[PDB]
Enzyme design. Structure first.
Site, PDB file in Angstrom:
ATOM      1  N   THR G   1     -34.378   9.260  -7.017  1.00 12.02           N
ATOM      2  CA  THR G   1     -34.723   8.230  -5.999  1.00 12.02           C
ATOM      3  C   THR G   1     -35.390   7.038  -6.685  1.00 12.02           C
ATOM      4  O   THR G   1     -36.251   7.211  -7.546  1.00 12.02           O
ATOM      5  CB  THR G   1     -35.751   8.754  -4.920  1.00 12.02           C
ATOM      6  OG1 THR G   1     -35.281   9.939  -4.234  1.00 12.02           O
ATOM      7  CG2 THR G   1     -36.001   7.652  -3.911  1.00 12.02           C
ATOM      8  N   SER G   2     -34.979   5.828  -6.315  1.00 11.00           N
ATOM      9  CA  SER G   2     -35.581   4.586  -6.832  1.00 11.00           C
ATOM     10  C   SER G   2     -35.801   3.705  -5.604  1.00 11.00           C
ATOM     11  O   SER G   2     -34.839   3.296  -4.951  1.00 11.00           O
ATOM     12  CB  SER G   2     -34.649   3.876  -7.821  1.00 11.00           C
ATOM     13  OG  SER G   2     -34.617   4.538  -9.074  1.00 11.00           O
ATOM     14  N   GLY G 128     -40.535   6.698  -6.751  1.00 14.39           N
ATOM     15  CA  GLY G 128     -39.319   7.442  -7.000  1.00 14.39           C
ATOM     16  C   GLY G 128     -39.207   7.684  -8.495  1.00 14.39           C
ATOM     17  O   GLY G 128     -39.887   7.020  -9.285  1.00 14.39           O
ATOM     18  N   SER G 129     -38.353   8.623  -8.890  1.00 10.51           N
ATOM     19  CA  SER G 129     -38.184   8.941 -10.300  1.00 10.51           C
ATOM     20  C   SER G 129     -37.851   7.714 -11.150  1.00 10.51           C
ATOM     21  O   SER G 129     -38.495   7.480 -12.178  1.00 10.51           O
ATOM     22  CB  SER G 129     -37.106  10.017 -10.468  1.00 10.51           C
ATOM     23  OG  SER G 129     -35.896   9.676  -9.811  1.00 10.51           O
ATOM     24  N   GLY G 130     -36.865   6.927 -10.714  1.00  7.27           N
ATOM     25  CA  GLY G 130     -36.469   5.746 -11.463  1.00  7.27           C
ATOM     26  C   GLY G 130     -37.523   4.650 -11.613  1.00  7.27           C
ATOM     27  O   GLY G 130     -37.399   3.765 -12.463  1.00  7.27           O
TER      28      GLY G 130
END
Lengths: 244, 244, 198, 204, 250, 243, 196, 222, 233
Positions: G1-2, G128-130
């Site tokens: 997720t970004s 988010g991860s990104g």
């Protein structure tokens, strides 16, 4: 038949709830209190009958604050008033906890409204023996309200309840007519001090102590505060002067 | 408060009687008469359908004879709906017993439990008693054929022949007059119809106004069989017994 | 575990139960009677978890005695064993299950025949000529499978048991301090006070 | 450990020409120890038959439960329950214990008293229904049963033939399973009659 | 607060009467007439749609309700009581039956459930009996077609034909005359329409009458296809038109 | 005996006096209201009366916004009206959460009607002395008016009126529809429907209105709103230029 | 997720990728991580899909009832309800939420609610991860009071980089513009942002 | 298990394989993985069979009662909301993975729900162990504006991808078409590409082959 | 009239009264007199203990709630025990949780609110006891008068019970006088004993008949009975 006035939630043949009406009696029988909405706040005042010299002056405070921006005053069974304020306090705390923003006066009014209305739904409870005048400043303007034992309530320009409510309502109506532009916080305080003095005639027998509080965007920063010292004495005189 | 409308269904009269129980019994005394007669080789249950019409579906009807178990049945006198409530919990007690012990529930044990439930509505709860009286016809390997009766009070007793509902006095006298210990199912069937025929408040005693059941131990088998006579079966036996 | 054996002969049921009660390093008692009479013609032996064992047995006993008084009647051995199975079957899915295994020996006065029921703590019941709980069956079943005859007298049964107990005393690692034996027949329950050398 | 492998045992049901057959072994063991050679795993409520493999205590409990429910069903409905209906009852009763299931493998067999149509069904421990047209297997030797059935079975067998087929399926499967055997019983069911036969097999 | 009415509001008077139930029956008698007729291949239930104003839309108010796809109900008495009774009946049909046996309940059992609900309102604490009498018509595989009447007391009985409400006495009489055990559905619908005409004061047409039947399966009302065993609901409410058509052959 | 008139149990005639007296309470405000359906909107008119000069006119209303799409007008005491309003709002919000779509006007009416029916049967609950008129432009049924009373009764209307002079307003509306032969005001704009509504209100009551004598609510596809004094004044002017 | 939300001159914009994975498998490549809780109050979801959806649904429910009684809620009030749910139920939730809304008096506002359940008001937020890969980039390119065009570009670039490095992110870049003018939906396909 | 859902110009279609397994063993060669929630709202389910079925009928039951109560055709967004809130409540312990589709007053819809309660929307979806085999096909042939027939072919092809390439899937293909203006049509065994070749021999036993010890008649009549 | 509206506390009379509450207040008047007064450094409670027989004790009328607070009762003893116990907890709570001595004005609010609840709900009954609360807190000495109606008032002095009016008039007179008896307890106590004797009539305050309590600046609420009050008779 009859007996329609013995239980609380019973509709009489003409659609009335006598127990609520009898509660109103306890209200009329009480001290006179009022509220005046000004151009950026509200003022609350009340008559404190001095039963004797033994009552410590300035002590037995009657007006109450809900949260940090709301003022409440009532006439009738005092203990019932406190009970209702307690509920309003829990009511307000809960609202702020979930929504962060302090409770809007209208929202707060309906909270007290719904609660009081609730005590006219069952015969296992008694209606509230008080009419309450309350209000304050919020996100958009100042608001003044009065709540009846029936749970009924509306927004007022000026409001009064108690022994000398008629005198008051008359005086308030005058102000309403003679100031379509809006009284000021400073002004309303004096005006309030006067109206209590006048309305005190319906109880001229006993001596009293005046109590005032206000909540003005400019005068108190939107926070409910009690009128003390100088500002108070100044208004006590403004009345003593116009009472003669 | 509520106390005002509370009938207090569970109090004693100055004479030490239970108002509601007494009035429930009065109610039952107007219900179609039901009779139970116990013979040496079986038991007979007979009941008079109170009120009927040409259009009443008699083949799909059953207002007085209910099967509780494969070895126990009852004759109802009073409020049908009330009776059903009790009958259902009775049917469940029978099954619980069976699941616990892997044996069919002894007739009295089931009658006592159902009676205790009635007794309950008599001592606590503030509810009205069940307007129902039962005649229990059943068989078990400890007392064989048994006939019991229970009413609103929760009291129960055993009989050789008994009736419940309307004109029980007349019915009881007629039974105590022609009943004999060595009777036979067929003899009992006859006595039952005769008794009902003489105590009916109706013109004649036709099949459409009766319900019949017998619990016999068919010699050609060795087990206990319940038979809830069909409309035609009742019509038949009604002719043979000379009542046409 | 303890020794719990049961054999159903011609006109009675016999229960043999070890007398030892051990708690780790020491044998606290060597004269323990692992049995409870549920009714005049029904006996129940048991073995298992330290406290559950007697608590369960006495609980069952109380319930059957209550039934006896209420109905002025003695439930059939079958009835009592079904009642007991249900109690154990509830227990296995409860917060803290009773870890008790039992043998119910009773003489059905109506059928006039003895009956032996084996029920483990899971509520697993089965009716048998002879049965055991724990390791007991492993050493004795081959012997019972051989000598058992439906027409055995109570005396023949006691001799077959003696043989079983001897095999147990020989091949088993634990010292169960002998067994107490009891007979259930048409006349009730009596204890064979002489098996320490019968 | 595995509640389904403590007691052992198997059940199998097959459909034939205007008939159904349901069979089971008779063993009840305690792990390696054989305990009973008379533990039947097939029961019936009216004309509907139910076989139950798995944890013996649950097999017993479920039977007592269904006797109870079908008994009250008959009293209210005033008619015996049918295979299709019972199957639904078995399913909902099992799923009711979705998170603390009975460790059993139920099998239903019977003929609809009104349509005469043969019926068999299997369920997993939590009620999922498998309505097969041919056969249903269950128990500690179910892999073996599947093997036997997949080969020995053919449609519309006559009662006397289905009996041979189902018995050979049960018998040879149980002889490849350490926890099954010690006797077997086969039920041949027809609209009007039901015959029950005990088979002769190894006792080891 | 808290309902403190935990005692019965319906009790036995010295004469043995249960006043509240008697009074509930009275309320039923004032109600608009409704009736049910059982034919050999179906059942019909009908009543009058007494519009309480011409401004009201009589369609937005069905007095004839579907309980299960093979059972329908109609009533006489207090409408609101009937409405909630219908909601409870539809639910109990699922909770106490469909969710357990995977099939809808047979007419007698659902009627039994409804009756139980009413019996309780006759004994539970703090309530009054239901002020209605219902006529439930349905069909199930093992009992065929049936028609039941359920009174405020919780008592129910099977009928070949009957009426309840305002002119029940007269209507029941007219019904006894025309009923026989060889009526085909259309015949019953016809007799139903005739019987009802007597009880109606004003307009008598498909817009002032509400009528439903329990007949054959309506595969066209199923909504899907592919399951041979699911053939459609036996319950079908007649349309305003279907009624008028039969009114001409009156 | 004589208590069958204090709680909701049957009278020997099979009546529920408490429900009857509750109906009496609905007229306590002496306010009349009416609702009519447009070609694609629904309008509700209600008299607004502010006797006390000390009152803030802007806070005196009997028209409520239950949800984005549903509007409700109440005939009866304000404390009971507000109780009903809060419940309705809560019910409409919960319904959306549970079922994924906006609660239909007719459905919310049924729900409130059912709640009322209960006060009718349970003795500890008193009926609410109010009559609720719900309006909206349902996504399935189009313009809708559903009204419920203290008896727990409810139904849909082509148009309706409530209050002391309910009968006059009703026969007035009846007559118009007998004439037009359609069951709605064949107008494209809600403004004209509002004007129609106000006009017939005047004819029936035989009274003229100022911009502060009325209260107006309008429901359209995806929205229900109430007009202001000035939005009304504009309406009052238009109707004037025709008479 | 970004995901990210940026406040600019005319209000605020929310951006997000559209990839959801179960392991290395892309279960959905057209996911909409921008959820509406009110007309002009939206949120960016990160963490458990089940958890954030359930949370969003409850918030939307609360703001709809709040509106029925007190009118339009503030963006702060919305972030409050989110926080109440996230903090009070921190032990059973895995939700990282960015609340973004447009008020007339307050213009655009952005609140970030990380795992713990704490709230943080910022000029813009990323999660988010990104997001880890674009911390440097965003901090060097964010500017207060950018135009709608500049903002849409700041977000398009940031997220394309997030997507570039994070295999958990991808698909299309979705955006939602919240201003006085109303609500605008934007979408940018791979072929466009991949070559920025 | 292999289940897919595909949207087409005027509706939606869902298909599934018919294999059921217990570990490596095929317990049911023809089990139905398609479930009806309401007449025009169907479900394709993967995961725990008892669960897909149970959850499908519970919500179905409530949807029916809701329908009767509101006098409206059930909506897919409703079956969807009730399903996810139920599954969410059980934190994934109810192993239901569904592809829910259908038509209602508001149009045709296609969604997916996972055991934990999250939902997705798309024009084509696949779930189950054949999930990847099916998705490869869908990603290769889906296009906007498919016709009812093109969709049934595509969905049918995707299930085949799983039947042949996934060990968890096999046997037949069930399909259910839900078109906006018509009745939903359930095509059980729309394809049966796995018929067992005739055996090499008959195993019918000569009567009397089995040894019997005892025999008796069972009493079925009370 | 009244008879129809005095069955419970949940009923208002046509005039707006709560008879059950009024009946409760009546239990107070029937109670033995007790007096309370304060200067600016002390607060005193003088109470006349009543005896059943001459073989009976003179029931205690003063209860300590904390080290800085206490009260005197007139009416139902049980109810005072209930209310004082509730006050003891409220004092204790303030100390343990906030490390703060409970303000006398706040103690009064608590008592009011507790009593209020027994006047609006069915099933209960109002408290049948009057209370005088004295205490020395962060704002000096204090005296409170509690009525079952829930009304609590702050005063310089007062009295409740039978003939309490005698002392009340006396105190309203002696006001300007005792309100200044700062730094001298013996004087405040004597003044209190003089006010109380203004309500005597039956007998005269004896040693085992008089009961006095004091609290102030550097005086933890202490109770004096018997020989200890001898130097005041």
């Amino acid at each position: 038949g009859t007996g329609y006035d013995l239980s609380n939630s019973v509709f009489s043949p003409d659609g009335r709830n006598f127990q609520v009406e009898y509660a109103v009696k306890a209200v009329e029988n009480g001290t006179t209190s009022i509220g005046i909405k000004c151009n950026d706040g509200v003022v609350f005042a009340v008559e404190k009958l001095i039963t004797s010299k033994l009552l410590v002056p300035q002590k037995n405070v009657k007006i109450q604050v809900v949260d940090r921006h709301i003022g409440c005053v009532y006439s009738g069974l005092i203990p019932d008033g406190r009970h209702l304020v307690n509920r309003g306090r829990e009511e307000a705390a809960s609202f702020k906890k979930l929504y962060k923003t302090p409770i809007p006066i209208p929202a707060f009014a309906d909270r007290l409204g719904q609660y009081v209305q609730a005590h006219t739904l069952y015969n296992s409870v008694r209606p509230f023996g008080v009419s309450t005048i309350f209000g304050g400043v919020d996100k958009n303007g100042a608001h003044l309200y009065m709540l009846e034992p029936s749970g009924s309530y509306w927004g007022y320009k000026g409001a009064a309840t108690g022994k000398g409510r008629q005198s008051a309502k008359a005086e308030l109506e005058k102000l309403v007519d003679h100031h379509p532009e809006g009284l000021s916080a400073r002004e309303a305080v004096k005006q309030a001090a006067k109206i209590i003095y006048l309305a005190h005639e319906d109880n001229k027998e006993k001596d009293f102590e005046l109590e005032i509080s206000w909540c003005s965007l400019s005068e108190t920063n939107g926070l409910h505060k009690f009128v003390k010292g100088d500002l108070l004495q100044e208004a006590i005189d403004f009345a003593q002067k116009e009472i003669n | 408060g509520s106390r005002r409308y509370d009938s207090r269904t569970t109090i004693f009269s100055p004479e030490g009687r239970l108002y509601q129980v007494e009035y429930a019994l009065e109610s039952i005394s107007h219900a179609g008469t039901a009779i139970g007669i116990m013979a040496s080789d079986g038991i007979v249950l007979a009941a008079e359908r109170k009120v009927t019409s040409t259009l009443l579906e008699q083949d799909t009807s059953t207002e007085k004879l209910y099967k509780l178990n494969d070895k126990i049945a009852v004759a109802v006198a009073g409020l049908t709906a009330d009776a059903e409530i009790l009958i259902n919990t009775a049917r469940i007690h029978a099954q619980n017993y069976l699941k616990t012990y892997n044996e069919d529930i002894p007739v009295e044990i089931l009658v006592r439990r159902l009676s205790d439930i009635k007794q309950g509505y008599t001592q606590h709860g503030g509810l009205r008693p069940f307007g129902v009286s039962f005649i229990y016809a059943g068989y078990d390997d400890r007392y064989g054929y048994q006939l019991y009766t229970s009413n609103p009070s929760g009291n129960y007793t055993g009989w050789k022949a008994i009736s419940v509902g309307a004109n029980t006095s007349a019915a009881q006298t007629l039974l105590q007059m022609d009943y004999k210990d060595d009777m036979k199912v067929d003899d009992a069937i006859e006595l039952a119809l005769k008794t009902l025929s003489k105590t009916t408040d109706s013109s004649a005693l036709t099949y459409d106004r009766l319900e019949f059941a017998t619990i016999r131990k068919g010699a050609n088998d060795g087990e206990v069989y319940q038979k809830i006579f069909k409309p035609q079966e009742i019509k038949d036996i009604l002719v043979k017994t000379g009542i046409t | 575990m303890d020794i719990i054996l049961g054999i159903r002969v011609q006109d009675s049921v016999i229960l043999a139960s070890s007398k030892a009660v051990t708690r780790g390093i020491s044998v606290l008692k060597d004269s323990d009677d692992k049995t409870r009479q549920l009714s005049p013609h029904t006996l129940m032996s048991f073995a298992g978890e330290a406290g559950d064992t007697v608590q369960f047995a006495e609980y069952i006993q109380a319930n059957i005695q209550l039934y006896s008084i209420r109905e002025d009647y003695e439930l059939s051995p079958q009835a009592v064993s079904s009642f007991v199975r249900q109690e154990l079957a509830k227990s296995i899915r409860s917060r803290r299950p009773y870890q008790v295994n039992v043998l119910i020996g009773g003489y059905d006065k109506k059928k006039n025949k003895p009956e032996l029921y084996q029920i483990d703590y899971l509520g697993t019941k089965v009716e048998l000529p002879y049965g055991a709980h724990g390791y007991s069956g492993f050493y004795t079943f081959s012997l019972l499978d051989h000598h058992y005859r439906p027409d055995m007298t109570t005396e023949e049964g006691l001799d077959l048991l003696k043989l079983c107990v001897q095999e147990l005393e020989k091949r088993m690692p634990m010292d169960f301090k002998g067994v107490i034996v009891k007979i259930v027949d048409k006349d009730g329950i009596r204890q064979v006070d002489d098996f320490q050398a019968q | 450990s595995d509640p389904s492998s403590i007691n052992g045992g198997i059940v199998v049901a097959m459909t034939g020409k205007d008939c159904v057959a349901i069979a089971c072994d008779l063993r009840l063991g305690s792990q390696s120890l054989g305990v009973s050679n008379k533990f039947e795993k097939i029961f019936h409520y009216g004309h509907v038959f139910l076989g139950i493999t798995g944890l013996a205590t649950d097999v017993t409990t479920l039977n007592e439960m269904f006797r109870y429910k079908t008994n009250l069903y008959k009293l209210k409905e005033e008619r015996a329950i049918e295979p299709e209906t019972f199957t639904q009852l078995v399913s909902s009763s099992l799923y009711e214990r979705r998170f603390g299931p009975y460790f059993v493998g139920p099998v239903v067999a019977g003929i609809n008293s009104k349509s005469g149509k043969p019926f068999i069904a299997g369920f997993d421990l939590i009620g999922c229904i498998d309505e097969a047209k041919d056969f249903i297997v269950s128990g500690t030797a179910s892999d073996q049963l599947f093997g036997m059935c997949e080969s020995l079975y053919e449609p519309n067998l006559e009662p006397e033939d289905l009996f041979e087929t189902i018995s050979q399926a049960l018998l040879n499967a149980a002889d490849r399973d350490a926890l099954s055997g010690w006797g077997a019983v086969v039920y041949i069911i027809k609209k009007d009659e039901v015959v029950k036969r005990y088979l002769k097999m190894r006792q080891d | 607060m808290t309902d403190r009415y935990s005692f019965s509001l319906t009790t036995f008077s010295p004469s043995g009467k249960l006043g509240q139930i008697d009074y509930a029956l009275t309320a039923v008698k004032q109600g608009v007439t409704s009736l049910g007729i059982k034919a050999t291949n179906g059942v019909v239930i009908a009543t009058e749609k007494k519009s309480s104003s011409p401004l009201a839309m009589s369609e937005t108010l069905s007095k004839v309700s579907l309980l299960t796809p093979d059972i329908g109900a109609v009533y006489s008495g207090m409408g609101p009581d009937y409405r909630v009774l219908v909601d409870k009946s539809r639910k109990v049909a699922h909770t106490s039956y469909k969710r357990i046996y995977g099939e809808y309940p047979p007419t007698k059992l659902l009627v039994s459930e409804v009756a139980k609900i009413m019996q309780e309102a006759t004994q539970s604490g703090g309530v009054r009996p239901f002020g209605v009498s219902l006529l439930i018509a349905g069909h199930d595989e093992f009992n065929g077609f049936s028609l039941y009447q359920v009174d405020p007391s919780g008592s129910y009985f099977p009928w070949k034909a009957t009426a309840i409400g305002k002119g029940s006495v007269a209507a029941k009489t007219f019904l006894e005359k025309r009923w026989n055990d060889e009526l085909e559905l259309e015949d019953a619908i016809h007799i139903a329409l005739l019987t009802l005409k007597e009880s109606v004061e004003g307009e008598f047409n498909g817009d002032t009458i509400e009528l439903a039947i329990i007949g054959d399966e309506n595969p066209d009302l199923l909504g899907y296809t592919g399951i041979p065993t699911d053939k459609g609901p036996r319950f079908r409410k007649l349309t305003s038109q279907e009624i008028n058509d039969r009114l001409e052959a009156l | 005996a004589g208590y069958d008139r204090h709680i909701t149990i049957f009278s020997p005639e099979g009546r529920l006096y408490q429900v009857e007296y509750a109906f009496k309470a609905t007229n306590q405000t002496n306010i009349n209201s009416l609702a009519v359906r447009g070609k694609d909107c629904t309008v509700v008119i209600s008299q607004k009366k502010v006797p006390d000069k000390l009152l803030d006119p802007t806070t005196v209303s009997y028209i409520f916004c239950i949800s984005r799409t549903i509007g409700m007008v109440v005939n009866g005491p304000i404390p009971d009206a507000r109780n009903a309003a809060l419940r309705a709002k809560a019910e409409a919000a919960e319904f959306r959460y549970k079922y994924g779509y906006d609660m239909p006007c007719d459905v919310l009416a049924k729900r409130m009607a059912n709640l009322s029916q209960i006060y009718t049967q349970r003795a500890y609950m008193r009926p609410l002395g109010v009559i609720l008129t719900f309006v909206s432009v349902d996504e399935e049924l189009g313009p809708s008016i559903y009204k419920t009373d203290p008896a727990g009764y409810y139904v849909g209307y082509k148009a309706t009126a409530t209050g002391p002079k309910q009968q006059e307003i009703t026969t007035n509306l009846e007559n118009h529809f007998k004439k037009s032969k359609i069951d709605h005001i064949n107008e494209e704009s809600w403004e004209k429907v509002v004007e129609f509504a106000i006009t017939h209100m005047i004819d029936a009551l035989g009274t003229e209105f100022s911009k502060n004598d009325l209260e107006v609510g309008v429901a359209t596809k995806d929205k229900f709103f109430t007009l202001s004094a000035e939005n009304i004044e504009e309406r009052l002017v238009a109707i004037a230029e025709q008479d | 997720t970004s995901i990210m939300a940026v406040t600019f001159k005319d209000g605020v914009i929310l951006g997000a990728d559209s990839r959801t994975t179960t392991g290395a498998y892309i279960a959905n490549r057209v996911t909409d991580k921008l959820t509406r809780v009110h007309d002009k109050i939206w949120c960016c979801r990160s963490g458990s899909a089940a958890d954030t959806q359930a949370i969003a649904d409850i918030v939307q429910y609360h703001l709809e009832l709040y509106t029925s009684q007190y009118g339009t809620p503030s963006t702060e009030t919305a972030a409050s309800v989110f926080k109440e749910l996230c903090y009070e139920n921190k032990d059973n939730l895995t939700a990282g939420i960015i609340v973004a809304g447009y008020d007339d008096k307050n213009k655009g506002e952005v609140y970030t609610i990380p795992l713990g359940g704490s709230v943080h008001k910022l000029p813009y937020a990323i999660a988010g991860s990104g997001s880890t890969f674009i911390y440097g980039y965003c901090d060097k390119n964010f500017r207060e009071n950018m135009s709608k065009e500049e903002t849409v570009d700041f977000i398009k670039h940031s997220l394309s980089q997030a997507i570039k490095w994070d295999g958990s992110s991808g698909g299309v870049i979705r955006m939602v513009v919240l201003t006085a003018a109303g609500v605008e939906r934007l979408i940018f396909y791979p072929d466009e942002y991949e070559q920025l | 298990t292999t289940i897919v859902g595909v949207k087409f110009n005027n509706g939606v279609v869902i298909a599934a394989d018919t294999r059921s397994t217990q570990g490596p063993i095929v317990a049911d060669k023809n089990c139905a993985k398609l479930h009806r929630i309401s007449p025009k709202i169907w479900c394709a389910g993967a995961g725990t069979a008892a669960d897909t079925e149970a959850v499908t009928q519970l919500i179905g039951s409530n949807i029916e009662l809701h329908s009767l109560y509101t006098s409206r055709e059930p909506r897919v967004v409703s079956a969807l909301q009730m399903l996810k809130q139920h599954l969410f409540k059980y934190q994934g312990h109810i192993g239901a993975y569904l592809i829910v589709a259908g038509v209602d007053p508001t149009g045709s819809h296609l969604f997916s729900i996972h055991a934990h309660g999250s939902t997705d929307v798309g024009y084509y979806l696949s779930l189950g162990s054949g999930s990847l085999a099916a998705m490869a096909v869908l990603e290769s042939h889906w296009k906007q504006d498919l016709t009812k027939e093109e969709a049934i072919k595509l969905a049918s092809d995707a299930i085949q991808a799983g039947i042949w390439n996934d060990l968890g899937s096999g046997s037949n293909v069930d399909v259910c078409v839900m078109e906006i203006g018509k009745d939903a049509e359930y095509l059980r065994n729309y394809l049966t590409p796995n018929v067992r070749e005739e055996k090499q021999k008959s195993y019918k036993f000569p009567r009397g082959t089995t040894a019997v010890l005892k025999e008796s008649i069972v009493n079925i009549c009370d | 009239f009244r008879n129809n509206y005095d069955g419970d506390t949940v009923t208002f009379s046509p005039t707006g009264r709560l008879f059950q509450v009024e009946y409760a207040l009546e239990a107070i008047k029937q109670g033995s007199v007790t007096v309370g007064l304060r200067s600016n450094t002390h607060a005193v409670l003088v109470a006349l203990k009543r005896n059943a027989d001459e073989l009976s004790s003179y029931q205690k009328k003063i209860i300590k709630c904390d080290e800085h607070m206490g009260l005197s009762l007139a009416g139902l003893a049980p109810d005072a025990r209930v209310l004082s116990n509730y006050l003891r907890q409220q004092c204790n709570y303030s100390s343990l949780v906030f490390n703060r001595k409970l303000a006398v004005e706040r103690a009064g609010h608590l008592l009011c609110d507790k009593a209020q609840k027994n006047t609006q709900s069915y099933g209960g009954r109002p408290y049948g006891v009057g209370l005088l609360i004295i205490g020395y807190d962060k704002s000096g000495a204090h005296l409170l008068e509690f009525q079952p109606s829930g009304n609590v008032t702050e005063l310089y002095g007062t009295a409740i019970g039978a003939r309490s009016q005698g002392a009340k008039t006396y105190l309203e007179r002696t006001l300007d006088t005792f309100i200044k008896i700062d730094g001298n307890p013996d004087e405040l106590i004597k003044a209190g004993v003089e006010a109380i004797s203004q309500s005597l009539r039956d007998e005269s305050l004896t040693v085992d008949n008089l009961s006095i309590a004091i609290v102030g600046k550097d005086t933890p609420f202490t109770i004096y009975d018997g020989e200890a009050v001898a130097k005041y008779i």
